[PDB]
Amino acid sequence: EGMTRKDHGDVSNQLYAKYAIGKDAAAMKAVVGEEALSIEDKLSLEFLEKFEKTFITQGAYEDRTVFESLDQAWSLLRIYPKEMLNRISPKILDEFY
Amino acid sequence: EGMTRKDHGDVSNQLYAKYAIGKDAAAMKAVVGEEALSIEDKLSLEFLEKFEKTFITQGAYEDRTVFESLDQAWSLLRIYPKEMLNRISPKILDEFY
Amino acid sequence: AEKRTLIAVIADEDTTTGLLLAGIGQITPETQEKNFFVYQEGKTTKEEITDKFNHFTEERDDIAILLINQHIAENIRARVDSFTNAFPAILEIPSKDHPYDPEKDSVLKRVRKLF
Amino acid sequence: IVAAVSPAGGDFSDPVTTATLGITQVFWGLDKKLAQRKHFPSINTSVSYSKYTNVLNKFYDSNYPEFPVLRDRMKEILSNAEELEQVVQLVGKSALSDSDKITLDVATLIKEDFLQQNGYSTYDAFCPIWKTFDMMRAFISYHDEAQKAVANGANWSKLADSTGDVKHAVSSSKFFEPSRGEKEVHGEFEKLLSTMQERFAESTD
Amino acid sequence: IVAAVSPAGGDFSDPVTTATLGITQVFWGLDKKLAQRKHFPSINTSVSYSKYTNVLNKFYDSNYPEFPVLRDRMKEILSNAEELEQVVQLVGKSALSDSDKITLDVATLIKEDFLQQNGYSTYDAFCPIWKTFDMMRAFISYHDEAQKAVANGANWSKLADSTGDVKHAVSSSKFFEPSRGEKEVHGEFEKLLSTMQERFAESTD
Amino acid sequence: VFPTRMTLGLMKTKLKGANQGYSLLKRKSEALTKRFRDITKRIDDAKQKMGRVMQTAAFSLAEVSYATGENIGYQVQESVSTARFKVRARQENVSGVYLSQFESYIDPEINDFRLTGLGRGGQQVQRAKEIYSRAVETLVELASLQTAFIILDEVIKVTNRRVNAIEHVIIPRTENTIAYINSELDELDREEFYRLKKVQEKKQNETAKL
Secondary structure, eight states: SSOSSSSHHHHHHHHHHHHHHHHHHHHHHTTTTTTSSOOHHHHHHHHHHHHHHHOOOOOOOOOOOOHHHHHHHHHHHSOOOSSTSSSSOOHHHHHHO | OOOOSSSSHHHHHHHHHHHHHHHHHHHHHHOOOOSSOOOOHHHHHHHHHHHHIIIIISSOOOOHHHHHHHHHHHHHHHHHOOOGGOOOHHHHHHHHH | OOOOOEEEEEHHHHHHHHHHHHOOBBOOOOOOOBEEEOOOTTTSHHHHHHHHHHHTTOOSSEEEEEEEHHHHHHHHHHHHHHHHOOOSEEEEEOTTTTOOOGGOOHHHHHHHOOO | OOOOOOOSSSSSSSSHHHHHHHHOOOEEOOOHHHHSSSSSSSOOTTTTTESSSHHHHHHHHHHHHOTTTHEEEEEHHHHHHHHHHIIIIIIIOSSOOOHHHHHHHHHHHHHIIIIIITOOOSSSOOOHHHHHHHHHHHHHHHHHHHHHHHHHHOOOHHHHHHHHHHHHHHHHHOOOOOSSSSHHHOOHHHHHHHHHHHHHHHHHH | OOOOOOSSSSSSSSHHHHHHHHOOOOOOOOOOOHHHSSSSSSOSSSSEEEETTHHHHHHHHHHHHHHHHHHHHHHHHHHHHHHHHHHHHHTTSSSSSHHHHHHHHHHHHIIIIOOOOSSSSSOOOOOOOOHHHHHHHHHHHHHHHHHHHTSSOOHHHHHHHHHHHHHHHHHTTTTOOOOSOSSSSOHHHHHHHHHHHHHHHHOOO | OOSSSSSHHHHHHHHHOOOOOHHHHHHHHHHHHHHHHHHHHHHHHHEEEEEEEHHHHHHHHHHHHHTTOOOHHHHHHHOOSSEEEEEEEEEEEEEEEEEEEEEEEEEOOSSSSOOOOOGGGHHHHHHHHHHHHHHHHHHHHHHHHHHHHHHHHHHHHHHHHHHHIIIIIHHHHHHHHHHHHHHHHHHHHHHHHHHHHHHHHHHHHHHOOO
């Protein structure tokens, strides 16, 4: 603590969940079309792309503090209500939303 | 013989074919709805649950010979009309429906 | 969805008067334009029917059903065939002094392809 | 003996896993893909079996829980939900029967409250055997009202929206553990039950 | 060292190919489907990489060509083309957008004019980095102006029929011997650039 | 190309998925084609019914105009600035897919029109409206079916495409992948046994001989 937060494990978990769905939403599009897709799956598709080219894409001389990483992660994660987020304690998610 | 009936073969055919259509009917129902489901599918939908809950589901000390099995067969089948039961001889049927 | 509640008319003069007695068209309050096109035989233009058809089908999305006389629909056939959507619906109904003729009907042409 | 087993041939049909499933009587599942979305242990109903069920459930009936009833119904929800899910993917559905949506919906809840647990948050994985009975009791009850409401007439959207306030509370009841008394059946759950029935009436009419 | 290997029946996981791939830093592919239509050797971008690509573009930029800027767009085009093709197959060409139609055409042209080394008169003639660069200026130019055009309202049909002559010319350019103005920039490639410009404008309004 | 270890687990469930999905898509097509035949017949009828209802009314309107002694239609167009008979959109599930339907409602904006007062001839115009309000309503309820019919035609095409797609592409792609990986996987295992055996024969021999 003091350069890696308490919310660190919480936020990872959330970031993976939205990404699992996003990957799958691509797959349903290929076969059938926009037939099994919906408002939820369509968000997830957007999520998979924004995450891939913003979070993962960095320099090779870029030094990134564990404090920086967490700040950027939360900014990205604004794409769903607080009630759709339950992979995180409701205490923690208000402080850092 | 004398410990089976000769009606054994005829019932094995009827029981089998209706349970299979019912398996198809479950999947169908989910796509189409109930506000667009076929009248034959409804009979098949019911048949699927009664064959499982009478013929397959039974107690841990229940005992059965071919005559007992055979009585329970006719009560599942009774619900279908005679003109949907056509793998059976007209003889047998007019006696056990 | 529920945002379309108007019936537009493309019909001959006497037929449009009748429909209007029943009350199905109007002069809109948001645009000041009819939801009806009054047509006469041999005394109105081929171009005007075209403009009206487009206006109600594509530049209006508050029309639920556009009724159109087959005979009038025939004049502007390219434009009737070419609108293929169901919002708004395009319905050819037999014109005046003519019974049902299948050879003027845009929707029946669509149905032919596949069944 | 509570034993973990794991692949070793890289398959799941490698000798190690073949020998172990044969000798064991109890298996509770876990899936890696769902586990990543964070819902571990993410039990597979199909690979799971227990032989011990009958004698153990007889024992629990004596101890006070009405458990065995719920258990079959917990399994029944998760099973139908599975099947329905392949049908949404495969056909690429344009509609659902109003009951099937309920099945899927009630399964989602099961996922959160039981399956999503974290072994270093002790507010999010701890319940005595009776507390567990009460939480499951609430779910199985919700399914029971919901099936009746569609039958008497009411749209699914009406069912979900009018039930509303109690649906939030049961979702969020996974953030609790005994801390309101040394009591294993709480006012927390007993209050919900009467309110749930009250909610049902609204949905129906 | 340029070292050739062979797959065991379309299996690229055979020990020899995997081993050589372990050691190499550059991988250049070979696609069976594309050879059947006569495009051998057939290199895409999902079966090939080069670590030298990054430094190599920096050195070519210096010598004269605009190559690094064109290389990035070129990679993208092929990468999108494959994915877009899978939708044509399954769903049909009815789910496409107009810009995606554009990506399909430009791609088909690239397949033929670089990858194919098969004759039609004469096996193809020495094409340098300079020649190769001109081809890339004309394909990339076609794609940008056409997408602008469709975005800004315009027929697909109008745009494809109009490029016409220019397409025949790039195909056959490689058979013609290098230098036709210069090696550097040929008069034959220089002139197309004007033709695209003239077309883009007719189309827009 | 693909993993040589445990492609069988993901591929096995795909293959089953495909044949199961195909069977099911066929039932959805069968239902869509089932309804389609029926509506095509009902719609041709409905065109004549509407033709007639309009024509009989239309003629009565023509008669009313010549007998009174003036052309009414001009005056009627001027008076109208609301649409009495309006419609409410609703979705009805016919087959898997929801179609659009219209239910007319009559809203009392206007009752007749403020133009009749043509003395004796005016009763002919008032009655003419009464006959037409009833005719228009027949057209509107019939017109609802037309909307669904266009909607069915658009859906069937997406559905015919899918039934082909599964059979022709997916099912042989699953077959070729599963069998080829199965065959390579068993090979690694078999050669090992032969290599262990080959060195053990060498060992056995060496032990045995003096």
